[PDB]
Design an enzyme around this catalytic site. Structure first.
Site, PDB file in Angstrom:
ATOM      1  N   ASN A 165       0.829  -1.200   0.000  1.00 35.25           N
ATOM      2  CA  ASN A 165       0.000   0.000   0.000  1.00 35.25           C
ATOM      3  C   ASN A 165       0.854   1.235   0.000  1.00 35.25           C
ATOM      4  O   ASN A 165       1.859   1.335   0.712  1.00 35.25           O
ATOM      5  CB  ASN A 165      -0.911  -0.017   1.236  1.00 35.25           C
ATOM      6  N   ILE A 168      -0.956   8.603   1.866  1.00 29.72           N
ATOM      7  CA  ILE A 168      -0.560   9.774   2.674  1.00 29.72           C
ATOM      8  C   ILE A 168      -1.242   9.656   4.051  1.00 29.72           C
ATOM      9  O   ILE A 168      -2.453   9.463   4.150  1.00 29.72           O
ATOM     10  CB  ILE A 168      -0.999  11.096   2.019  1.00 29.72           C
ATOM     11  N   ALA A 169      -0.459   9.816   5.092  1.00 30.67           N
ATOM     12  CA  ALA A 169      -0.926  10.017   6.475  1.00 30.67           C
ATOM     13  C   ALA A 169       0.065  10.922   7.166  1.00 30.67           C
ATOM     14  O   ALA A 169       1.285  10.766   6.891  1.00 30.67           O
ATOM     15  CB  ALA A 169      -1.043   8.700   7.245  1.00 30.67           C
ATOM     16  N   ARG A 170      -0.377  11.862   7.972  1.00 31.26           N
ATOM     17  CA  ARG A 170       0.518  12.838   8.534  1.00 31.26           C
ATOM     18  C   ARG A 170       1.505  12.209   9.506  1.00 31.26           C
ATOM     19  O   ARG A 170       1.201  11.219  10.195  1.00 31.26           O
ATOM     20  CB  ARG A 170      -0.270  13.936   9.250  1.00 31.26           C
ATOM     21  N   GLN A 187      -8.120   3.106   7.611  1.00 37.02           N
ATOM     22  CA  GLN A 187      -7.143   3.414   6.588  1.00 37.02           C
ATOM     23  C   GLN A 187      -6.279   2.184   6.313  1.00 37.02           C
ATOM     24  O   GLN A 187      -6.001   1.372   7.208  1.00 37.02           O
ATOM     25  CB  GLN A 187      -6.336   4.624   7.024  1.00 37.02           C
ATOM     26  N   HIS A 188      -5.763   2.057   5.087  1.00 40.30           N
ATOM     27  CA  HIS A 188      -4.963   0.871   4.743  1.00 40.30           C
ATOM     28  C   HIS A 188      -3.672   0.774   5.518  1.00 40.30           C
ATOM     29  O   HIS A 188      -3.241  -0.342   5.832  1.00 40.30           O
ATOM     30  CB  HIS A 188      -4.746   0.800   3.233  1.00 40.30           C
ATOM     31  N   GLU A 279      -5.690  21.085  10.734  1.00 39.23           N
ATOM     32  CA  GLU A 279      -6.205  19.986   9.912  1.00 39.23           C
ATOM     33  C   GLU A 279      -7.174  20.486   8.838  1.00 39.23           C
ATOM     34  O   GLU A 279      -7.510  21.692   8.744  1.00 39.23           O
ATOM     35  CB  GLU A 279      -6.670  18.807  10.786  1.00 39.23           C
TER      36      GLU A 279
END
Ligand SMILES: Cc1cc2c3c(c1C)C(C)(C)C[C@@H](O)N3c1c(nc(O)[nH]c1=O)N2C[C@H](O)[C@H](O)[C@H](O)COP(=O)(O)O
Ligand SMILES: Cc1cc2c3c(c1C)C(C)(C)C[C@@H](O)N3c1c(nc(O)[nH]c1=O)N2C[C@H](O)[C@H](O)[C@H](O)COP(=O)(O)O
Ligand SMILES: O=C(O)c1cc2ccccc2s1
Ligand SMILES: O=C(O)c1cc2ccccc2s1
Ligand SMILES: [K+]
Ligand SMILES: [K+]
Ligand SMILES: [K+]
Ligand SMILES: [K+]
Ligand SMILES: [Mn+2]
Ligand SMILES: [Mn+2]
Lengths: 500, 500
Positions: A165, A168-170, A187-188, A279
């Site tokens: 996979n 994007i994740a912060r 989320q993946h 955010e």
């Protein structure tokens, strides 16, 4: 290499488009870079490239702000997104979303392994870097850390090797060799983390690649299905196998032209302080004290003169609106069609802070279904709000064929005039909710459940015999020959360019 | 005479402002005048004055379109409204609404009777006019009649003489000497009609004055209280007693400078076909077959070179948005304050098709109330939705002190991010509803009842300890000295007038 396949070429494309401002004087990564970028995003100005970032050493790093934000002109509004995808800069949203969906019924084109690439031009081992010594930005004045990761792609693979996979994740700097970040259901990155945690044997092999091929960062931002390897989806979309190099310290593969690569592990046991962060909905709650996932960095590799992309996210309009909202809407459109629902188009209106998706209905097909608002709303909400693609979306607005869902003014008109509050809506309290929305995580109810609604802005006869109104507008309330006369005589009577 | 006191002077003011286009070539009242006006309203162009209207005879009539619509510039957006009121053309909405409210705690200034005025320059008796022979516009192609009355003031008086009401309500030509129009509860023309019907002895003495003093047409569009004579309210607002002349055929009084006056009766027994009409929410339902009130015209008086104002209403933005919405919001603000509710400001967002009103809360006062969302929403909705001032409004949005309710973008942001659907709302099904909204009169439920909601976009700590967030925007997420540096260096770094 083409702009959609190589971030460095994408930067050149923005310059050639007269869509870049190169700042060559010193700029502080403590707030100043992000403030400039924020102003850009709020005014739809040119993307800033910070070539002289206070604290940049030995090539790490320059910053590109606002990589997926809007242009001022209507004619090329979405041009930065089009430049991620090899589309003309005048491409419509429909065209961009159709390009992002095109790989959904193509065979994947798996990536090609190459022995080296620009991302190997420089390296720093476990004794040579300190993440606290890099020019990592403070993006908002109350952020709980310096958010290195706002526009890179996390790379994790299932334990069995069958799914890799990209998403994007912060993430923010925790100390010299660790990040903390969001890893949350559904989320993946979370799904794969859970697989490794149930196996229980090791931390998750991980890489985070910044300045990846633009077509790849788009797919990283899109909720393509569970189990689908983004690399092969991007390959099919672009018609080209992506070139990947192996990490030095693990057996993951990163894009060969990545600007900067972090290699390491995502812990199956450790956490650390994460956030708060300004955010996508426009807020920060200073001091919020959450724990997040913890990443260990073992190696950095990078291009000469590396460029870090950055999203200075918040109020309209930035990548969290243009990409999160629109790409979720695209997937929701497909999901609806796959469930035999007569949806032609979907978009997350910017005015809703991308918390709504408007669904355009083919009302000829709706009529043949011989159904009712209550039944149809329930069916649509069940499909969407029970699926991962619906995660971020709290209100669905059903509209008929006269509404262009890509035009927020027209969505707002239809919602406000065609959906009777209460009666024409169905609330969903037993679905996963998106806690980042203030009224969820900082609201009156459960942070993670409910708060969703289907608002039916279809009029009654759209289910039966057909639209029974005309708009009271210039287009619909005057005959063609009169409209044309008015337009032709407009200036000559005394009244007031496409590109502008 | 001043522009706010004399319609002919108001037209001159628009010309002097470079806010008028004089069309001196022939224009057809069958659709063409209204189509031009519609285009003006959709583009915020200059007001059109049709000096050569096909079918104008013996002075009846020219048309002024878009008298209360928007200007293109932000700096003088509301200038046409300001010119109704003697305000600078740069006046803000707050200033316009405060002017319209100012007479609410002043003694009335009753009108002054004068023996004649310009409205007596010409007359036509019961044998000399035919309403079907005047250049009455067809405003929308599917309208059920020619709507002579879109911007005049109906004048009716209670049987006991103690209340004379001035109000706008639509009316169309029925035959040579009759109109039909809307006379619906809870409107004051309806309330007074009911008084005459219960007395049972005669038809209601009536006059309809077109091209009245602009300050008077504003009050005609505002829901000032039951029993309050608009003439004295306008007198107090303006500081001047309005000059009125007696009708020739009844004992009502009309503004001395009215452009055109119809004198006659509003029947307490007869009805006739009325509508359909392209209405304020943007729709017409062709063929709708309603009965309306029936007016008999006995006399016409008019100025030399009379000008008929016309509203080509529908989709944004025209008088039905700028005046109906805003003036209802003003009255709702006052009503809330009179009920000891901590409301500082109210506005009907254009984006809502003026079906919402956003209410700005003084949250310091809210905190002292030691209340909760459920309780406070119920209290606000009870006050507003049980009152005539709330008639046209179906959604109230409560927002805290950081939101400028006159800025629709900011209302939409707060609604979308701070109000959890369902939980943070209270539905009102047992209140009078506004049937003109499509989802009411052409919707799934009762046309005249319910469909209202209070949506609380106050965050939880706004009821307790105070706002607990900062916006993720340029204004709030960067320190003052940095913001100023960015602005000061904006152009020099390479990035891009008030009046424009
Ligand atoms: C475009 C973009 C997407 C995301 C984010 C950002 C940007 C710019 C941040 C600025 C970094 C803010 C951040 O809150 N953020 C973010 C995030 N998803 C999370 O789980 N966690 C996050 O912290 N997404 C959204 C995800 O990228 C999509 O939901 C995608 O669908 C996930 O991929 P997958 O799980 O479907 O493979
Ligand atoms: C500014 C304006 C106001 C109104 C209207 C128009 C304009 C331009 C039309 C274009 C003619 C369309 C029409 O639908 N219309 C209209 C109407 N009120 C009605 O009962 N009936 C109507 O047909 N109002 C609203 C009323 O004027 C206000 O509600 C006012 O408050 C009434 O006065 P009162 O009863 O409070 O004295
Ligand atoms: O930082 C923020 O804006 C976001 C956190 C998350 C988590 C999941 C999906 C979208 C976003 S957007
Ligand atoms: O013709 C239309 O737009 C209207 C009819 C009514 C009736 C009552 C209040 C406002 C309006 S607006
Ligand atoms: K993805
Ligand atoms: K509906
Ligand atoms: K009135
Ligand atoms: K709330
Ligand atoms: Mn995925
Ligand atoms: Mn009144």
């Amino acid at each position: 290499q083409p702009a959609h396949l190589c971030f460095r070429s994408f930067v050149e494309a923005l310059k050639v488009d007269n869509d870049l401002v190169e700042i060559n004087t010193p700029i502080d990564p403590n707030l100043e870079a992000a403030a400039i970028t924020r102003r850009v995003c709020e005014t739809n100005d040119k993307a800033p490239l910070f070539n002289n970032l206070i604290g940049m050493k030995n090539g790490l790093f320059r910053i590109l702000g606002a990589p997926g934000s809007l242009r001022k002109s209507s004619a090329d509004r979405y041009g930065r997104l089009a430049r991620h995808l090899a589309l003309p800069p005048t491409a419509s949203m429909r065209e961009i979303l159709d390009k992002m969906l095109s790989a959904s019924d193509m065979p994947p084109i798996p990536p090609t392994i190459v022995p080296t690439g620009p991302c190997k031009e420089n390296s720093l081992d476990d004794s040579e870097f300190d993440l606290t010594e890099l020019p990592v930005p403070l993006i908002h004045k109350s952020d709980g850390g310096k958010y290195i990761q706002t526009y890179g792609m996390h790379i994790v693979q299932s334990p069995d090797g069958t799914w890799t996979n990209w998403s994007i994740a912060r993430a923010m700097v925790h100390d010299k060799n660790h990040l903390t970040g969001l890893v949350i259901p559904p989320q993946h990155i979370w799904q794969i983390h859970q697989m490794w945690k149930k196996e229980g044997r090791s931390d998750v092999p991980w890489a985070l690649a910044f300045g990846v091929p633009p077509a790849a960062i788009m797919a990283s931002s899109m909720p393509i299905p569970d189990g689908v390897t983004e690399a092969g989806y991007v390959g099919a979309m672009t018609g080209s196998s992506l070139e990947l190099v192996k990490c030095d310290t693990n057996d993951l593969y990163v894009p060969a032209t990545s600007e900067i690569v972090l290699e390491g592990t995502l812990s199956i046991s450790e956490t650390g302080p994460e956030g708060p962060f300004g955010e996508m909905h426009g807020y920060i709650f200073p001091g919020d004290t959450h724990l997040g996932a913890k990443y260990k960095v073992n190696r950095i590799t990078y291009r000469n003169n590396a460029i870090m992309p950055m999203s200075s996210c918040g109020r309209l309009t930035d990548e969290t609106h243009t990409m999160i909202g629109s790409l979720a809407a695209a997937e929701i459109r497909k999901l609806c069609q796959q469930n035999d629902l007569p949806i032609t188009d979907a978009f997350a209106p910017f005015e809703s802070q991308v918390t709504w998706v408007a669904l355009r209905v083919d009302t000829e097909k709706l009529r043949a279904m011989k159904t009712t608002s209550e039944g149809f709303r329930k069916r649509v909400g069940d499909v969407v709000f029970n699926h991962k693609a619906g995660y971020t979306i709290h209100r669905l607005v059903l509209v008929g064929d006269d509404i262009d869902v890509y035009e927020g003014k027209d969505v707002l008109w239809a919602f406000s005039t065609r959906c009777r509050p209460g009666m024409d809506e169905t609330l969903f309290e037993d679905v996963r909710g998106f806690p980042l929305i203030p009224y969820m995580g900082h609201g009156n109810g459960p942070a993670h459940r409910g708060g969703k609604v289907v608002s039916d802005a279809l009029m009654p006869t759209e289910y039966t015999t057909g639209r029974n109104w005309e708009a009271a507008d210039f287009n619909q309330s005057y005959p063609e020959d009169l409209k044309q006369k008015v337009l032709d005589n407009w200036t000559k009577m005394g009244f007031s360019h496409h590109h502008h």
